[PDB]
Amino acid sequence: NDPVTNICQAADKQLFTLVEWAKRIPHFSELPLDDQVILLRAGWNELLIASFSHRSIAVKDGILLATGLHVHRNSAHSAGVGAIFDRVLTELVSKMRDMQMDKTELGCLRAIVLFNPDSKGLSNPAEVEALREKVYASLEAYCKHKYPEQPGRFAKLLLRLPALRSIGLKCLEHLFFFKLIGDTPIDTFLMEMLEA
Amino acid sequence: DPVTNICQAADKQLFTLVEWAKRIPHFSELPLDDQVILLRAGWNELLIASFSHRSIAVKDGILLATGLHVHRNSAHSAGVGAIFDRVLTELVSKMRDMQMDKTELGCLRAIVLFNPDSKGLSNPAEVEALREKVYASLEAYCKHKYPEQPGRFAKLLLRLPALRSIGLKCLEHLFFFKLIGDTPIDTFLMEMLEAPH
Amino acid sequence: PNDPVTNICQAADKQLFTLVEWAKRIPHFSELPLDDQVILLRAGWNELLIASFSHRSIAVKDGILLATGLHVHRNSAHSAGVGAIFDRVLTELVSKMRDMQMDKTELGCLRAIVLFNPDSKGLSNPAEVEALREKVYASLEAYCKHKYPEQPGRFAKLLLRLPALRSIGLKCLEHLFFFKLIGDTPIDTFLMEMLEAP
Amino acid sequence: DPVTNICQAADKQLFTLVEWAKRIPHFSELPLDDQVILLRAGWNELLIASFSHRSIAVKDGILLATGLHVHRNSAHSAGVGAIFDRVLTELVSKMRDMQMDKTELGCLRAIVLFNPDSKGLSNPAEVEALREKVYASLEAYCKHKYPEQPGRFAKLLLRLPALRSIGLKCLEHLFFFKLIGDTPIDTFLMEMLEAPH
Ligand SMILES: CC1=C(CCc2nnn[nH]2)c2ccccc2/C1=C\c1ccc(C(C)C)cc1
Ligand SMILES: CC1=C(CCc2nnn[nH]2)c2ccccc2/C1=C\c1ccc(C(C)C)cc1
């Protein structure tokens, strides 16, 4: 009934999904708790974007949110975030589709993103760089075994990260996720009050 | 818990705003989708205008509606100090020095509300006509309430560009998040991390 | 020729000077301390420029007429990547100036109000600048009421284009609007000639 | 003139950038419209990558092409202390510590240049294919230069997200203007004021 509160609840649930995921990554929970907070704050955007972009591989012209919401271009443009939507489709989803990025590869990429040594305030960044290195070593080993005819695949996966970074910035800037899940609930709320 | 309080308080502020808009003469005569466009386009400036005027009783700080006081120290610490000082020096102090009264504030807000430039309006001309009715009322008010201050009406209108730019800066730099949403997110996260897995 | 940025700078240089020459003609402006004059010009230059070319562009439909003679159309503005800001200028300023037939006296007054901006950071004496601003808008009001007595709402309507000018000014500075407009083509040209060149 | 200095310096950098691109294998075989697009999409990151690597021999400062040495003092003074520190911590110091050499730098810049995401590219796939050739070559080089660092190749590619956000932040904050254009403009304006009448 109360739109902002419902939106926050949805944000709450989403963020907790991410926290549980990170705790299942080997060695994340062994890091200091402050450093864990720092990594999740620094990374939550790209992590969520990476996640919903891969999920949207099977669908036409849209984004599947973890909330179940199926966002089309029209809706995204209605919410004032059509440009960013387009970029997600073009630079992430379609490229994920085209190379058939699998779930193991996505997880490794998200774990790389999570273990971001550049995150400000890290008591021990070198330690975080070292976890990231273990992760990418494993991803490379995986790609070579699973896709031997594709020697450049590991690098191709790594090279989606600059795109993810810039889209992540734009999403943070324009409150992408919040505008999408909130736009219609706000219109609906407003309309009900305005008619009463 | 901190985050929950913020969301509820936002929901309350949104409620009060819509109720205020409905009592504005002729607002409800507009097509409902236009009323919605206007409220969504105006909420930020409308809010900044209110808390600025409410803050004239305070030195170098701001009063958000729930008796929540924020000092410029906290703004500067959070990295939004320059913006906070623009609120203080371009809105608050100016409102204080001219003794902007509550009728003049209500009019400025109604003018902000009736924004004919808002994208998607089915009829911007009707919105411009409602805006002109409001500023005609305001000019009538100022002339008769303050007949010894001939430039007062204009002075009030000339606080609107400051409101516009401060409004943009606030959103651009996540002013509100950095002031009142930052720490609660840290707390929120720590709790999640400590939760049973 | 062969130095695209230099040429862009010369054009901007010439444009800013037109603004500075206009300001020195505004009564009392040159009586302010020099450092205040510089503060006012830096704070106001973008809005002053936008206001000038917007008003100049009433003479055309769907374009911006620059002081040099360059007529910028929508296609150029789109190529330049600033189509959105371009459309705001046309919609919020040009067409609204046209709708009310804002005249050159009113344009001059509105720009002088913009120049005498008492919120400009660092002014030695902000009240002195507010005092000059107040003189200007009293003159503008008496002018509108004398020239257009049948439009009692005109003065206020003029002032009420200022918030739009403010937001568009911020967007223009942010995306280097003016510089992309006068600079997009010469850059492509310089690049192209170089890439074709042996 | 100081401003005239800056413009001429930028024209120089542009010229050198273009001549560099032409010497990148297969670059000139792309459509000319596509070459222009890539150079325009890439110039900012390409410049930042170069002055960052150039600054490794410099203590607590940044070196711009004309021996223009910029220290933290100036950066903090200009309100861009934060971005300055990012360039040092995320680019300059990481380049230094892993001893990124000019061949690796060259490969990374070429990867940047061959950006298949650039808007308006007539054939994105063609650009992506050139990127892959460049990165295969960079991997081959890392393998023999440091066979005992199997993670060097990936480590190099993983500075590119930092370069991307740094590039965006520099533009958003007018980083270069605030550092080298700010005072010259004051001088320029004062000269304009000294002109007759
Ligand atoms: C728009 C907004 C964001 C979204 C991000 C943002 N955009 N601009 N500033 N912050 C945010 C995030 C956290 C906390 C608040 C906020 C906020 C606005 C707000 C909420 C509550 C109050 C009162 C009732 C206390 C006042 C303003
Ligand atoms: C992009 C840019 C602006 C436009 C505004 C801007 N955007 N991002 N930063 N500044 C500007 C303005 C004034 C002076 C420089 C600049 C500048 C970049 C620049 C120019 C010359 C050099 C030389 C040293 C090779 C280096 C960088």
Curated annotation (Swiss-Prot), chain C:
<protein>
    <recommendedName>
        <fullName>Retinoic acid receptor RXR-alpha</fullName>
    </recommendedName>
</protein>
<feature type="binding site">
    <location>
        <position position="67"/>
    </location>
    <ligand>
        <name>all-trans-retinoate</name>
    </ligand>
</feature>
<comment type="subunit">
    <text>Homodimer. Heterodimer (via C-terminus) with RARA; required for ligand-dependent retinoic acid receptor transcriptional activity; association with RARA is enhanced by pulsatile shear stress. Heterodimer with PPARA (via the leucine-like zipper in the LBD); the interaction is required for PPARA transcriptional activity. Heterodimerizes with PPARG. Heterodimerizes (via NR LBD) with RARB. Heterodimerizes with NR1H4; the heterodimerization enhances the binding affinity for LXXLL motifs from coactivators. Interacts with NCOA3 and NCOA6 coactivators. Interacts with coactivator FAM120B.</text>
</comment>
<feature type="domain" description="NR LBD">
    <location>
        <begin position="1"/>
        <end position="198"/>
    </location>
</feature>
<feature type="binding site">
    <location>
        <position position="67"/>
    </location>
    <ligand>
        <name>9-cis-retinoate</name>
    </ligand>
</feature>
<feature type="binding site">
    <location>
        <position position="56"/>
    </location>
    <ligand>
        <name>all-trans-retinoate</name>
    </ligand>
</feature>
<comment type="similarity">
    <text>Belongs to the nuclear hormone receptor family. NR2 subfamily.</text>
</comment>
<comment type="function">
    <text>Receptor for retinoic acid that acts as a transcription factor. Forms homo- or heterodimers with retinoic acid receptors (RARs) and binds to target response elements in response to their ligands, all-trans or 9-cis retinoic acid, to regulate gene expression in various biological processes. The RAR/RXR heterodimers bind to the retinoic acid response elements (RARE) composed of tandem 5'-AGGTCA-3' sites known as DR1-DR5 to regulate transcription. The high affinity ligand for retinoid X receptors (RXRs) is 9-cis retinoic acid.</text>
</comment>
<comment type="subunit">
    <text>(Microbial infection) Interacts (via the DNA binding domain) with HCV core protein; the interaction enhances the transcriptional activities of the RXRA/RARA and the RXRA/PPARA heterodimers.</text>
</comment>
<feature type="binding site">
    <location>
        <position position="56"/>
    </location>
    <ligand>
        <name>9-cis-retinoate</name>
    </ligand>
</feature>
<feature type="region of interest" description="Required for nuclear export">
    <location>
        <begin position="88"/>
        <end position="108"/>
    </location>
</feature>
